[PDB]
């Protein structure tokens, strides 16, 4: 039995940006955005500021955001987890930061392997994560309900959120 059999994001575990294991069942009952981040992309500022906006405006309704740094796209996240943590803190991030991972290939974190094969997580244009700042919207049961590509600014997700609260 492996990740292909998982039924929910809530089954998974991941190290937070401080190295501590997190059981993602903490997100049971919470609409969640899962995104891969990087600090040195042209759209880093727009993505972080809009994710912060979304969290500020919707956390009280149950929105949670899980940010996974990854260095797989143009080496745009070269820093240590501590450096990334400090970078995010500079944007007043109050959502959840995770330790750096891979999102594609055989060493990808299993949550990312799983999200990519879900009916609403498969890409319109293929499943692989194409660049930094792909976003998955996850319902309160941990089911993937929509995928938004790197070119879709986080505020576009706002249109869909109330459907899942």
């Amino acid at each position: 039995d492996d990740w292909r059999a998982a039924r929910s994001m809530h089954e998974f575990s991941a190290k937070d940006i401080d190295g501590h294991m997190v059981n993602l069942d903490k997100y049971r009952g919470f609409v969640s955005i899962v995104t891969n981040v990087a600090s040195q992309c042209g759209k880093t500022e727009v993505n972080y500021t809009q994710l912060v906006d979304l969290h500020a405006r919707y956390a009280e309704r149950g929105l949670r955001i899980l940010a996974f740094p990854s260095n797989q796209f143009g080496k745009q996240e070269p820093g240590s987890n501590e450096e990334i943590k400090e970078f995010a803190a500079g944007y007043n991030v109050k959502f959840d930061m995770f330790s750096k991972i891979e999102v594609n290939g055989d060493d990808a974190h299993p949550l990312w392997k799983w999200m990519k094969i879900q009916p609403k997580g498969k890409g319109i244009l293929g499943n692989a994560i194409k660049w930094n700042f792909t976003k998955f919207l996850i319902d309160k049961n941990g089911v993937v309900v929509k995928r938004y590509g790197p070119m879709e600014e986080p505020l576009v997700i706002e249109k869909d959120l109330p459907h899942y609260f």
Partner: peptide, 13 residues
């Protein structure tokens, strides 16, 4: 059911 960091899954017995 839980999936560990390495991708293995275990459920209630």
């Amino acid at each position: 059911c839980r999936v560990d960091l390495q991708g293995w899954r275990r459920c209630r017995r």
